[PDB]
Symmetry: C3
């Protein structure tokens, strides 16, 4: 690619990489939520 097409393509690839990283953060936060809830339930 080249020109505007290369510039748009770089932006889209970087968005896709950020999207994959965000999806993994969502599931790391939900796995934490479950481990923290288990600790809270145990202490109670």
């Amino acid at each position: 690619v080249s020109g505007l097409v290369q510039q748009q393509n770089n932006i889209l690839r970087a968005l896709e990489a950020t999207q994959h990283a965000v999806q993994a953060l969502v599931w790391g936060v939900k796995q934490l939520q479950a481990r923290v809830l288990a600790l809270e339930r145990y202490i109670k």
Copy 2:
């Protein structure tokens, strides 16, 4: 819409979706940080 406006709107919608997920994750991490700190303060 089509052509460059369609392509630029697809990029802006994807960037906005990623920004919204980061703002929801910032709140979920603040809530987990407070819950983890309360567990650590109880245990100590």
Copy 3:
């Protein structure tokens, strides 16, 4: 600056800021994983 170069520079500055935010949150979730693991290991 104006036209397409202004629109593209605005998208690039916003995408860069979102990528920085996601990398900070990847480290913050790993810090909370370590804290939660310490709590689990002690309780066990």
